[PDB]
């Protein structure tokens, strides 16, 4: 069963907002990335020989390249200013829950945004950086994240601390 | 303070399905996609519409150009099986409404057939679906959803069919 | 007053070249 796919991903990369912006346009045919436009290069560059005809074609056209090089400004920085109003400052407060399993203490951190988070297990007020098992950051696909940070010990007062950009102060849940 | 983000416009055209898609991505999440057949902008979260807007006919034009380019790419010159993970969105409590997530990942071409199964029979209600989402590489991922009421009597399956599969697989889930 | 988004307009690529 043959199939054919023309796939293009135009990526705006912001290393610190609009202070440093890099445009990366990536062309794909079937399972193969063949062409790229890096704004740090200024021209098209073939990733594979299939993309070379398009590179030589478009790179020989001054006006094309001129419009491309400006898209760091005309498209990337244009859209960032807009998204900076609701996407960048978006904050969803995490729900934290502790429950035993099998022992295995489970700290469930649910429905939070953005993904930047830090979860620590404490034993009697002292951090435990050993025996930790995690599912890692899990993307729910609806702009929320979840994660399971589990401690693998046999118990007096265990504590799970969660730090997050949506919190002015760390959230704490204890388990006696 | 430092704000690092990656906004991605992702579009494609597929043969012989003759289907095209167009979407924006923000740090891994969908901002919106354009319904090509209806020429309308579909936001991932409804609230987004108060802040931004997109002229959907712009995407229709791109797909028209992509469709023509695909013919060029065809003249100029296997399948990848998906990973399927079935999990809950929130911690599962009996009697407390929740959502099962069927995560299809690392596959190509962007065409799948997903069927939610409650107790061995299909479910057409309370089911949600995403468009084909971008990855860092050349492959796609996709989210399928099912609202459900947790109980010890029920078991769930997510049946995913793809051209990269000799046989449709079903990932199981129960309380 | 929702701000209109900008987007990348796709480009036409030509034929006339073949690969083995």
């Amino acid at each position, epitope marked *: 069963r043959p199939w054919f796919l023309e796939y293009c991903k135009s990526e705006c990369h912001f290393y610190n907002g609009t202070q440093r912006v890099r445009l990366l346009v990536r062309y794909f045919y079937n399972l193969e990335e063949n062409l790229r436009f890096d704004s740090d290069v200024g021209e098209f560059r073939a990733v594979t020989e299939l993309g070379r005809p398009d590179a030589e074609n478009w790179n020989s056209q001054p006006e094309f390249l*001129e419009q491309k*090089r400006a898209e760091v400004d005309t498209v990337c920085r244009h859209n960032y200013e807009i998204f900076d109003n609701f996407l960048v400052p978006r904050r969803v407060e995490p729900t934290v829950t502790v429950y035993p399993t099998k022992n295995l203490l489970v700290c469930s951190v649910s429905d939070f945004y953005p993904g930047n988070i830090e979860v620590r297990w404490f034993r009697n007020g002292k951090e435990e950086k050993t025996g930790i098992v995690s599912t890692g950051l899990v993307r729910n696909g609806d702009w929320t994240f979840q994660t399971l940070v589990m401690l693998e010990t046999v118990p007096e007062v265990y504590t799970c601390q969660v730090e997050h950009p949506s919190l002015t102060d760390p959230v704490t849940v204890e388990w006696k | 303070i430092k704000e690092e983000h990656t906004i991605i416009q992702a579009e494609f055209y597929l043969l012989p399905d003759k289907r095209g898609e167009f979407m924006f991505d923000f740090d891994g999440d969908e901002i919106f996609h354009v319904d090509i057949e209806k020429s309308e902008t579909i936001w991932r979260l409804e609230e987004f519409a108060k802040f931004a807007s997109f002229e959907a*006919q712009g995407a229709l034009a791109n797909i028209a*150009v992509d469709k023509a380019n695909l013919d060029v790419m065809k003249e100029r010159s296997a399948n990848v099986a998906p990973e399927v993970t079935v999990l809950s969105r929130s911690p599962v409590n009996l009697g407390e409404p929740n959502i099962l997530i069927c995560f299809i990942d690392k596959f190509s071409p962007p065409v799948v057939n997903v069927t939610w199964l409650r107790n061995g029979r299909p479910v057409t209600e309370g089911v949600s679906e995403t468009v084909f989402l971008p990855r860092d590489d050349h492959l796609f991922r996709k989210f399928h959803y099912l609202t459900f009421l947790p109980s010890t009597d029920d078991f769930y399956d997510c049946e995913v069919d793809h051209w990269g599969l000799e046989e449709p697989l079903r990932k199981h889930w129960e309380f | 007053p929702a701000d209109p988004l900008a987007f990348f*307009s796709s480009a*036409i690529k030509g034929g006339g070249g073949s690969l083995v």
Partner: T-cell receptor
Amino acid sequence: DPKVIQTPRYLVKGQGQKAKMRCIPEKGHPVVFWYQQNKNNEFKFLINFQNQEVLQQIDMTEKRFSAECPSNSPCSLEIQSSEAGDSALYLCASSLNWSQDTQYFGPGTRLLVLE
Amino acid sequence: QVEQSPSALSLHEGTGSALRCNFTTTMRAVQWFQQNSRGSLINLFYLASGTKENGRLKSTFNSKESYSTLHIRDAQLEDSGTYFCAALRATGGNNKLTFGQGTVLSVIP
């Protein structure tokens, strides 16, 4: 330099008559545009082409106009039923690319629709 | 939307002036035309950034500040005509040039 050919230079029609205008894009240009320029120097986009295929057109063009860009024949724009408000300079433009570089305009057709 | 100024300009032969266009939204690139007596649009400039120079003409376009200019020096008789700026809306779905009001330029012999 790209040259775009348009015929006829001038054109007069009575209300209800068809008004056909022809255009020959620059050799090698796959993309063709049509604009309206009235007496107030206002420009209105009508329709664009990628080779033989119509890609975009406004509502007025779909209902009242009939545009075509076949091989074996020059491009054409035709008003099916000419009205007084159709009187304008109909400009044809071709481009090497879809939206990435300069559009080159022809001499245009000065259409005048009388009662 | 595009705002062009001045509406009209009468320049003595051999002297110079400048036209301006402000854009209310983001433009991918700007085109400058001269529409002569015949009514045919002559391409003067295409620029998506910076400054370009073409004979006695000169043009600057700044995407961030959303404006473009056209400078005319040493005015000749053939410079007469209506000058238009035109740009592509980067936020526009319809692929088209959006034109300015126009500058009707007359050269005093």
